[PDB]
Amino acid sequence: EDAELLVTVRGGRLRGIRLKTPGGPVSAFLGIPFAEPPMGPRRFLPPEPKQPWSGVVDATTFQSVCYQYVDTLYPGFEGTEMWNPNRELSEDCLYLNVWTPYPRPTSPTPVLVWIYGGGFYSGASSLDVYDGRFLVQAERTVLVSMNYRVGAFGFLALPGSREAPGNVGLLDQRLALQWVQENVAAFGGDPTSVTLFGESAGAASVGMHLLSPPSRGLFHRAVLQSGAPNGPWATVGMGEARRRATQLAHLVGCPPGGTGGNDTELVACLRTRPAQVLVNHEWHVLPQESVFRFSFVPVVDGDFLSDTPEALINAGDFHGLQVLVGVVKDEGSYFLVYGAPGFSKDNESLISRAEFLAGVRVGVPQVSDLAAEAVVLHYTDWLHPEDPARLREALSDVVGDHNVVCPVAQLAGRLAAQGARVYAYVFEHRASTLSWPLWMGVPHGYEIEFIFGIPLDPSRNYTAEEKIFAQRLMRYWANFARTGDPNEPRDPKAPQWPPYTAGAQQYVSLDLRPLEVRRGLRAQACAFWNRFLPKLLSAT
Amino acid sequence: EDAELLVTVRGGRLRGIRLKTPGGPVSAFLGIPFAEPPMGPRRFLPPEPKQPWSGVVDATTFQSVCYQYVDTLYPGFEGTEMWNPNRELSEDCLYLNVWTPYPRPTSPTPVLVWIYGGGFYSGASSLDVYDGRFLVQAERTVLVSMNYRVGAFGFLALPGSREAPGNVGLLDQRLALQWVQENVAAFGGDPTSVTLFGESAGAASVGMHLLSPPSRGLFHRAVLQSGAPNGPWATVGMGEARRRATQLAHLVGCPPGGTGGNDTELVACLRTRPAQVLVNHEWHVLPQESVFRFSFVPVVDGDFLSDTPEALINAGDFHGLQVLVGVVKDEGSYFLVYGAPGFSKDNESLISRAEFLAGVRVGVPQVSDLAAEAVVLHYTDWLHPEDPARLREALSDVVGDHNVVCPVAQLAGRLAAQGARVYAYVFEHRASTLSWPLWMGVPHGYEIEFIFGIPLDPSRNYTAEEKIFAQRLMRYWANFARTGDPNEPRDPKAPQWPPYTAGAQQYVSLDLRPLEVRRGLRAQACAFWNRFLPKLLSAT
Ligand SMILES: NC(=O)c1cc[n+](CCCn2ccnc2/C=N/O)cc1
Ligand SMILES: NC(=O)c1cc[n+](CCCn2ccnc2/C=N/O)cc1
């Protein structure tokens, strides 16, 4: 009843809201504070737990979005603005949301925790495509999603100093995980069956938590969608993070005039600046000749990450852990319209040979000219080295393999070979309502709406097949959250999803057709990135 | 009583609104349609007059802003967003506004007509800084302002063809001028005493009307604020206009693969595209290595402009015309934060010598290496060739002189020497409420709020001296509109404003201090741009 919309947690009382789905109602608790507002002197600091409150906190609507850059490449366009903030920006943003079935579960229920992506510079738990009402109604699981500080506010780092240690955006997620341990039982959720799942930078975050011992105790399973902590964009060195942080200070006038520039005076100067001012110079801090490179990302400090993600994945024991990994068919196409020459969402992006050669330097930055030739002469079809359509898909493969598919395949192989049960997929269905052009195929990010069951929304023009497809995927994700195995615990009639192993390298394709097993997550291309290219880079 | 808010014009009846000023009320008629909506098959075509309507058109609020790019360089910033659209974007935007004193004048009154700036790619008559309620109350004049199509919708040109003839944005302004001839009498205005005044691209527009015979009959005096038709940014050649238009068609997928590319099929394809799609690719049409260069500007076709503005100004007889021209102290500083390396509004923009040498390439983009050297070695202080503060102001002088001050001084000299009475000014007061940084001084466009008397708004924190100053400036502009002479028609107490002649080159400084006469509008620098540099291009 209306009594199930009232819940007490360790910090105080909450009033939720009843959400409707075509299959029945759901109880949602949107906007639960899990940390003290990280403002004024607490900007750039690790989060402090929210102190208990008197009265009833209203938990009926999403709270503020953390301060972030707002994408303006295509104003008024659905394909880009669906990721933009849909609540007002504020540094007061450390809130989490909880969906729970109606009636509330009597017995402890497995908990899904969502970590949004957005390159560590954007994103929000309030986005329409992260609506948890459909996954909770159809699979009677408990869904939690948190906000975490992005951009400079979450990942500006002057390593060594205590005024700006870095990775505070990861600590925000960790605190939200500690909050789930201490309070998800009150919503009917099992704190012993917690399944993290994220996408892009959210998936990378999930991977960073697997490799951080303090976070490792707060969950039991992991799902990484189109991202990995070992990606070339997901981390940064201490020296580069200090250079970026210092350059941002310079751009906003820090330190003032002629004055000392130790870490303490620099952060104090940064704390006096309005939040929007720091955001307005976020992209100017990089060399600014890049697609896929982000200014403030997790730093390898020796604290949250004792070593690089690659090192920790190799030297890591993963027995007793189940992972679900995967990518979309066309991982790189969405990013090409963000700086690759000759590309535009409003034409066919039939690029020339010279544009392809320049795009490789944009999509694979920082590498040497000989390394670029290895990429070009490996992704060229030499029977059609000038076909524009093939060059377009080649560059899309170049930036997709280098940034997503091969970092993911590298990780999935090391996990399976080191004792973790791993299941791998490739998402190959292009939504019928997709607004991006046809040549992008199944772009990065556009499986999320099917995992969250958005096709079930009656106010959307999804086909009957996509509705059944969405229910199928929700069953896969929920079964993995419940049992660690996406396969039906009692249904062998439907095609089976074999584990992924370093040898067989099996995965399944997710589309309207029944499950189909394949071998190799682009094994040929990924051997070039994972094996040959590092040996080639030790020429300088 | 309230019967003065109802007025009949040639097309039908209108209901206006009474606006309040601290000195008394004013009658405003906001949103008068003067053309048929240029939508669908009419896009890119010259405007057609608004056909008469039945009933009473509501004229109590500003109408839609013409489709245009929206500046996002500093989100949430007062200094940039005061120029952004403050009404909904639409192609249905050919509307004009009329302010008139209360009580309505019984004898014919001089008419001021405002043409907004915005580089021919943006701007709107509805901006708060253009509100004529204070100018009309204080000086009992009649103020008119129109919207004209900007960007591709106003200035896309495939010269020779009739599907996209070009300069249709200038024809929108002309139609609004024909409208003032036929209807301003109904508001108490004298159609024989019409003074055009504009700023930046608006000032350039005013100048192109002086040089177009069909427009010359529609007004009697001109005011040009920080702009001129002979500026290097204000016009474009036929060949370049065709190349730019074709590039925009390619970016939006026109024509579809395999279709012929004649002008008819190209424009037909462009007309099917949504307006926002064309706007989203406007800047991608240039080489895109330019501060101060705009994609779609008036073309020199032989129709609206029988020759280049430079030729028409030289070969022109300007007897019987009074012109008021001028500039602000720091014309170029506004534009450096829009692409000049090392510049940011949030620090002191202390640029290096290398950044200065690179910025000259951005501020003067069309030149050769040798021409750039002549610029660098002319604007360098050779006793302090590395002082960043001086280099900063040197680049501001480079950009300001090349784009505004010297094209204006060129025009003002030719006009006075060829029979026009000319008055020249330099605006030297930096508003106390200015939000741009101090190092920008008096940036481009920040005299407008004083000409329009915005300091009189009680909801603003302007000083008492700026209020008196704004009233003084309104008297100058109004006196010029009535008599052709900014000086008080019978008051020799105040210092007097001498005409500007090709020899004495006298102008006045407008600031809180009384008028002060000076000689030379950057005469030394402008000899370099107007006389010497054309001679080094001649070494092709
Ligand atoms: N203000 C700027 O100049 C700016 C440049 C690049 N970006 C890139 C962000 C968009 N993006 C979306 C997905 N991946 C990216 C990264 N491209 O580099 C944003 C802003
Ligand atoms: N989308 C873009 O990357 C973009 C580039 C340049 N501009 C030019 C800004 C307009 N402007 C304002 C004052 N001066 C200028 C002209 N700059 O060339 C706008 C947008």
What would the two tokens of residue A517 be?
């097993």
Contact A164, A156 (CB under 8 A): yes
Contact A39, A305 (CB under 8 A): no
Cβ neighbours of residue B212 closer than 8 Å, sequence gap 6 or more: B170, B174, B304, B305
What would the two tokens of residue A479 be?
């079964």
How far is the centre of ligand 1, averaged over its atoms, from the C-alpha of B211 (Å)?
44
What is the C-alpha separation between B426 and A335, in angstroms, rounded? 48
- Strand boundaries in A61-200, DSSP class E: 65-66, 89-90, 95-101, 109-115, 142-146, 189-199
Contact A319, A339 (CB under 8 A): no
Resolution in A: 2.6
Report whether B477 belongs to an annotated binding site. no
Nearest to A112 by CA among A14, A20, A199: A199
- The backbone torsions φ and ψ at residue A84, rounded to the nearest 5 degrees and listed phi first, read -75, 160
How far is the centre of ligand 2, averaged over its atoms, from the C-alpha of A35 (Å)?
40
What is the residue with the minimal CA distance to atom 4 of ligand 2? B283
Bridge partners of residue B221, in order along the sequence? B195, B322
What is the C-alpha separation between A143 and A140, in angstroms, rounded? 9
How far is the centre of ligand 1, averaged over its atoms, from the C-alpha of A121 (Å)?
10
Q: Is B444 a catalytic residue?
A: yes
Chain B interface test: which of A281, A346, A387 (most B C-beta within 10 Å) = A346
CA B484 to chain centre: 21
What is the residue with the minimal CA distance to atom 8 of ligand 1? A338
> A493 by DSSP, 3-state: which?
coil
What is the C-alpha separation between B269 and A408, in angstroms, rounded? 43
Contact A329, A400 (CB under 8 A): no
What is the C-alpha separation between B291 and B339, in angstroms, rounded? 6
Alpha-carbon distances of B264 from B165, B214, B241, B261, rounded to whole Å: 12, 28, 16, 8
Contact A305, A243 (CB under 8 A): no
Cβ neighbours of residue B47 closer than 8 Å, sequence gap 6 or more: B35, B36, B38, B94, B168, B171, B172, B175
What is the C-alpha separation between A273 and A279, in angstroms, rounded? 10
> A265 by DSSP, 3-state: which?
helix
Alpha-carbon distances of B534 from B434, B530, B538, rounded to whole Å: 37, 7, 6
Regarding the beta carbon of B338 and ligand 2, being less than 6 Å apart is answered yes
Inspect the interface and report whether the beta carbons of B344 and A277 lie closer than 8 Å.
Answer: no
Which residues in chain A have Cβ-Cβ distances shorter than 8 Å to B340? Answer: none
Placement of tokens 């330190």 in the chain: A255
How far is the centre of ligand 1, averaged over its atoms, from the C-alpha of A68 (Å)?
12
In CATH terms, A6-334+401-524 corresponds, of 3.40.50.1820, 3.40.630.10, 3.40.50.670, 3.30.70.80, to 3.40.50.1820
| A537 exposure class (CB count in 10 Å sphere: 0-12, 13-18, 19+) | middle
Nearest to A246 by CA among A227, A229, A224, A262: A262
Which residues in chain B have Cβ-Cβ distances shorter than 8 Å to A282? Answer: none
- How many helices (DSSP H) and strands (DSSP E) are in chain A? 19, 16
Regarding the beta carbon of B292 and ligand 2, being less than 6 Å apart is answered yes
Placement of tokens 């949103």 in the chain: B31
> B252 by DSSP, 3-state: which?
coil
A 264-283: CB under 8 A from B: 273, 276-277, 279-281
User: Pick the catalytic residue: B27, B205, B444, B449?
Assistant: B444
Inspect the interface and report whether the beta carbons of B70 and A75 lie closer than 8 Å.
Answer: yes
Q: Which of B251, B280, B283, B404 to mutate to test the pocket of ligand 2 (most atoms within 8 A of CB)?
A: B283
Bridge partners of residue B98, in order along the sequence? B29, B144
Contact B62, B125 (CB under 8 A): yes
Regarding the beta carbon of B120 and ligand 2, being less than 6 Å apart is answered no
| B514 exposure class (CB count in 10 Å sphere: 0-12, 13-18, 19+) | exposed
- Torsional class of B105: left (φ above 0), alpha (ψ -120 to 50), beta (otherwise): beta
- The backbone torsions φ and ψ at residue B290, rounded to the nearest 5 degrees and listed phi first, read -155, 120
> Given A73, A251, A276, which is nearest B76 (Cβ)?
A276
What would the two tokens of residue A27 be?
């109880």
> Given B75, B281, B284, which is nearest A70 (Cβ)?
B75
> Given A280, A284, A344, which is nearest B251 (Cβ)?
A344
What is the C-alpha separation between B455 and B472, in angstroms, rounded? 12
Q: Determine the residue of chain B that is closest to A347 in CA distance.
A: B253
* A347: contact with B, CB 8 A cutoff: yes
- Closest ligand 1 atom to residue A282 Cα is 1
Alpha-carbon distances of A59 from A17, A187, B374, rounded to whole Å: 7, 13, 66
What is the C-alpha separation between A67 and A93, in angstroms, rounded? 8
- The backbone torsions φ and ψ at residue B299, rounded to the nearest 5 degrees and listed phi first, read -100, 150
Cβ neighbours of residue A33 closer than 8 Å, sequence gap 6 or more: A11, A50, A53, A57, A63, A94, A95
Alpha-carbon distances of B31 from A14, A114, B16, B117, B145, rounded to whole Å: 50, 50, 9, 19, 10
Which residues in chain A have Cβ-Cβ distances shorter than 8 Å to B73? Answer: 280
- The backbone torsions φ and ψ at residue A236, rounded to the nearest 5 degrees and listed phi first, read -155, 155
DSSP A123-152: --TT-GGG-THHHHHHH--EEEEE----HH
Inspect the interface and report whether the beta carbons of A74 and B280 lie closer than 8 Å.
Answer: yes
What would the two tokens of residue B353 be?
């010598």
> Given B250, B279, B344, which is nearest A347 (Cβ)?
B250
Contact A180, A196 (CB under 8 A): no
Contact B100, B183 (CB under 8 A): no
C-beta atoms surrounding B457 within 10 Å: 18
Domains of chain B: which residue ranges?
6-334+401-524
* B284: contact with A, CB 8 A cutoff: yes
Bridge partners of residue A198, in order along the sequence? A115, A224
Contact A199, A116 (CB under 8 A): yes
| B458 exposure class (CB count in 10 Å sphere: 0-12, 13-18, 19+) | exposed
Contact A278, A152 (CB under 8 A): yes
Placement of tokens 């504020």 in the chain: A90
Torsion A473-A475-A478-A479 (CA) sign: negative
What is the C-alpha separation between B245 and B295, in angstroms, rounded? 9
What is the C-alpha separation between A96 and A124, in angstroms, rounded? 10
Contact B61, B14 (CB under 8 A): no
Inspect the interface and report whether the beta carbons of A251 and B347 lie closer than 8 Å.
Answer: yes
Inspect the interface and report whether the beta carbons of A253 and B347 lie closer than 8 Å.
Answer: yes
Inspect the interface and report whether the beta carbons of B252 and A75 lie closer than 8 Å.
Answer: no
If residue A203 lies in a helix (H) or strand (E), which one and from where to where?
helix A201-210
Contact B395, B364 (CB under 8 A): no
- How many helices (DSSP H) and strands (DSSP E) are in chain B? 19, 14
C-beta atoms surrounding B213 within 10 Å: 10
Inspect the interface and report whether the beta carbons of B253 and A76 lie closer than 8 Å.
Answer: no
Contact A168, A175 (CB under 8 A): no
- Count Cα neighbours of A147 within 13 Å in the Cβ-side half-sphere: 36
| Three-point CA angle B328, B333, B339, nearest 5° | 145
Which residues in chain A have Cβ-Cβ distances shorter than 8 Å to B252? Answer: 344, 346-347
Nearest to A340 by CA among A375, A366, A364: A364
Strand order in the sheet with A12-15: A6-9, A12-15, A56-58
- Exposure string (b/e) for A468-507, b if CB count within 10 Å is 16 or more? ebbbebbbbbbbbbbebbbbeeeeeeeeebbbbeeeebbb
What is the C-alpha separation between A352 and A358, in angstroms, rounded? 10
How far is the centre of ligand 1, averaged over its atoms, from the C-alpha of A66 (Å)?
18
| Three-point CA angle A334, A339, A345, nearest 5° | 45
Regarding the beta carbon of B291 and ligand 2, being less than 6 Å apart is answered yes
> B327 by DSSP, 3-state: which?
strand
The number of residues in chain B equals 540
> Given A76, A251, A277, which is nearest B276 (Cβ)?
A76
Placement of tokens 């001679």 in the chain: B535
Which is it for strands B56-58 and B12-15: parallel, antiparallel or unpaired?
A: parallel
Terminal-residue alpha carbon distance, chain B: 70
Cβ neighbours of residue B411 closer than 8 Å, sequence gap 6 or more: B207, B224, B228, B229, B230, B313, B325
What is the C-alpha separation between A154 and B455, in angstroms, rounded? 42
